[PDB]
Ligand binder design. Structure first.
Ligand SMILES: O=P(O)(O)O[C@@H]1[C@@H](OP(=O)(O)O)[C@H](OP(=O)(O)O)[C@H](O)[C@H](OP(=O)(O)O)[C@H]1OP(=O)(O)O
Ligand SMILES: Nc1ncnc2c1ncn2[C@@H]1O[C@H](COP(=O)(O)OP(=O)(O)NP(=O)(O)O)[C@@H](O)[C@H]1O
Ligand SMILES: [Mg+2]
Ligand SMILES: [Zn+2]
Length: 414
C-alpha cells in the first residue's frame, strides 16, 4: 500500500513528459509486475474559477489531491467519451517522501538535462499513479511484445468565424507544421519534422502509411517503439533527432524474429504493420472527435475565458457575439476547449504480439502482414489524458499569437 525508500531500487526510468515522470517496475512483487508508476513533477487542488468550470462533475471538485483529480477526470469525463476499452484511469498508491526523493535521485542521470532544469518530482504529494504498462501485451504471455507510441497532436484545421484577418493561414496550415518553424527558431529541435497530423487523421490508408513513415524518419517526441518495455526507437523523456543510418540499423536489428522477413526488410514491414493497425482500428477517428471540441479556436474561446473569470476582456478593445452568451454556455465552451486540449496532447500506445492460437478466446483485433505471412494481435490504449488547468487559457492565446505571427513573418519572406 505504501512505497518506501528501499522499494525505489525496483523502479527504472521509462520516460517523462512536461508533467509526469514515469518509471517501469523491474521487481517481483505481484502488485507491480507489469505496471508503471506515474509521478507528478513540480514546475487548493482546484482554483475557485475551476470549481465553477467543473461544477457538473462534483466528485471532481471534491478531489482531495491532484492524483485523485486526474484519476476522476479520466474516469468521469474522458471515459464516457472514448469508452473504457482503450483507457485506464489508474490506481493510486501511497508513496513516502523518501521514496519519491530516492526515485528522483536514482533516475536523475538518465533524464535530459533540460527536463531536470525545468522540474522535479513533487516530493510533497503523498500519492502516485499506478498504471498498466502497455508495453506489456496483456496483464498477468504470448512471447515478445513490440509496442508503438504515437503522440498524434491536433489532426484538424480550425475553420472559425473568430480567426483574425491577419491569421487566416491557420485555416490552411496545420498548427503542428507552423509550430515546427517556431521550435526550430527557438532551438528546441534541429530539423523540421516530416510528420503531418492531417495525413495520420485523414482516414486514408495511403496517407496514414505516409504519416507512419514520416514519424519513423523524424520521430521527435511523436513516435517511440519498445521491445518488451525497452526503448528501441524514439526519445527518452524528450524529442529525438532525425533517424540516422546508425539508428536505422539498431532498430532493424532489434526487430529480429518478431517481424519474420529478410535482414534489411523488417523495418518496412513493421511500418506497414503499424499503419494497418492504426487505420484498421479506427482509434484516431474517436480521438479526433474529442479534439474537435475546440469548436471556435483559441481566438474565439479566449473571449469566453475572460467572461468566466469575470475580467474585462483585454482582447477586445475600445466580439459582441461571444460576450453576449449566458455564463452556462461560456463555461461549456471553455470546458470543452480544455477537454480538447487533453485529446490534442495525449498519446496512443499500440501493443503487438504474434497471434496466439491457444488464446481461450481468440482476439477480434489483429493484422495480417502480406509478405511475412504473420498475424499479429494488437491492442490500443490512450495514455497521458491529463487535466489541463483553466488558467492556461491565457498562455494558449499568447503561444498561438506567437506561432501565427512568426509563421506570417516567415512567409512574408517570399
Ligand atoms: O501546446 P503544445 O501543443 O506545444 O503542447 C505542449 C507539449 O509540446 P509539444 O508541442 O507537444 O512538443 C509539451 O511537450 P514537451 O514538454 O515539449 O515534450 C507538453 O506535453 C505540454 O503539456 P503539459 O505542460 O505537460 O501539460 C503541452 O502543452 P498543452 O498545450 O498540452 O498544455
Ligand atoms: N500506462 C503506460 N504504459 C506504458 N508507458 C507509459 C504509460 N504511461 C506513460 N508511459 C510512458 O512514459 C512517458 C511519459 O508519460 P506521460 O503520461 O506522457 O507523461 P507526461 O509528462 O504526462 N506527458 P505530457 O504532459 O503530454 O508532455 C510516455 O511518453 C510513455 O512512453
Ligand atoms: Mg500530461
Ligand atoms: Zn473579448
Amino acid at each position: 500500500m505504501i512505497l518506501e525508500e528501499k522499494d525505489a531500487s525496483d523502479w527504472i526510468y521509462r520516460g517523462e513528459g512536461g508533467a509526469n515522470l514515469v518509471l517501469a517496475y523491474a521487481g517481483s512483487s505481484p502488485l507491480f509486475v507489469g505496471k508503471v508508476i506515474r509521478i507528478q513533477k513540480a514546475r487548493s487542488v482546484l482554483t475557485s474559477d475551476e470549481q465553477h468550470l467543473w461544477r457538473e462533475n462534483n466528485e471532481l471538485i471534491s478531489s482531495p489531491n491532484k492524483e485523485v483529480l486526474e484519476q476522476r477526470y479520466v474516469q468521469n469525463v474522458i471515459i464516457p467519451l472514448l469508452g473504457p476499452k482503450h483507457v485506464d484511469a489508474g490506481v493510486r498508491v501511497s508513496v513516502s517522501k523518501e521514496f519519491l526523493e530516492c526515485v528522483d535521485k536514482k533516475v536523475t542521470k538518465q533524464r535530459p538535462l533540460w527536463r531536470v532544469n525545468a522540474a522535479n518530482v513533487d516530493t510533497s504529494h503523498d500519492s502516485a499513479l499506478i498504471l498498466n504498462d502497455h508495453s506489456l501485451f496483456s496483464q498477468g504471455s504470448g512471447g515478445d511484445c513490440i509496442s508503438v507510441e504515437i503522440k498524434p497532436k491536433c489532426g484538424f484545421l480550425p475553420t472559425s468565424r473568430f480567426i483574425g484577418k491577419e491569421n487566416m493561414l491557420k485555416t490552411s496550415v496545420s498548427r503542428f507544421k507552423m509550430h515546427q518553424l517556431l521550435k526550430l527558431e527557438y532551438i528546441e529541435i534541429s530539423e523540421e519534422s516530416e510528420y503531418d497530423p492531417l495525413d495520420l487523421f485523414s482516414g486514408s490508408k495511403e496517407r496514414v502509411l505516409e504519416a507512419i513513415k514520416a514519424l519513423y524518419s523524424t520521430p521527435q517526441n511523436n513516435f517511440r517503439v519498445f521491445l518488451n518495455g525497452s526503448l528501441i526507437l524514439g526519445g527518452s523523456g524528450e524529442s529525438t533527432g532525425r533517424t540516422s543510418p546508425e539508428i536505422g540499423y539498431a532498430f532493424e536489428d532489434a526487430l529480429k524474429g518478431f517481424i519474420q522477413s529478410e535482414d534489411g526488410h523488417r523495418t518496412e514491414c513493421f511500418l506497414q504493420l503499424v499503419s494497418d493497425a492504426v487505420y484498421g482500428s479506427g482509434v484516431l477517428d474517436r480521438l479526433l472527435e474529442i479534439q474537435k471540441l475546440d469548436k471556435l479556436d483559441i481566438e474565439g474561446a479566449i473571449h469566453c475565458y475572460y467572461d468566466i473569470i469575470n475580467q474585462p476582456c483585454p482582447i477586445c478593445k475600445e466580439e459582441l457575439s461571444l460576450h453576449a452568451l449566458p455564463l452556462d454556455e461560456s463555461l461549456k465552451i471553455v470546458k470543452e476547449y480544455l477537454i480538447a486540449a487533453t485529446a490534442k496532447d495525449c498519446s496512443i500506445m499500440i501493443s503487438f504480439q504474434s497471434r496466439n492460437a491457444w488464446d481461450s478466446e481468440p482476439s477480434g483485433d489483429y493484422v495480417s502482414l502480406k509478405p511475412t505471412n504473420q498475424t499479429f494481435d494488437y491492442k490500443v490504449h490512450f495514455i497521458d489524458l491529463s487535466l489541463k488547468p483553466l488558467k492556461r487559457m491565457e498562455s494558449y492565446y499568447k503561444l498561438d499569437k506567437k506561432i501565427i505571427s512568426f509563421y506570417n513573418r516567415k512567409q512574408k519572406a517570399e
